[PDB]
Amino acid sequence: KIFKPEELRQALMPTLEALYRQDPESLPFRQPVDPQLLGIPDYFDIVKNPMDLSTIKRKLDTGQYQEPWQYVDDVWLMFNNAWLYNRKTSRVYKFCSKLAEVFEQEIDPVMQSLG
């Protein structure tokens, strides 16, 4: 049950790269949400634990995931936050749904492998 951080990064980065490759859908998720810049002062009231692709990448890069379910949980936290805050007609919401479709296909074989 022990995963070296470098091993995790090698196995999990391609799944992250798949999400980054999605244009236009990944662009709202490439950086943390800035509520002041975006003019959405209630964002941190609704979303208690922000997450985005840049933070997930940094966590992979700095060895902050002890095991792979932590990585999957952060990706899903990103998705759930967007589905929670944004209305169903918004680009972010629909883009989130696309990323989730792309992620589920990428992650299955990798998680089976890592076990």
Ligand SMILES: CCc1c(C(=O)NCc2cccc3ccccc23)[nH]c(C)c1C(C)=O
């Ligand atoms: C709505 C604010 C928000 C964004 C966001 O960065 N918006 C600006 C933006 C930047 C780049 C491309 C975009 C493409 C389409 C739409 C907005 C884009 N990202 C998330 C996750 C949220 C929330 C609240 O969940």
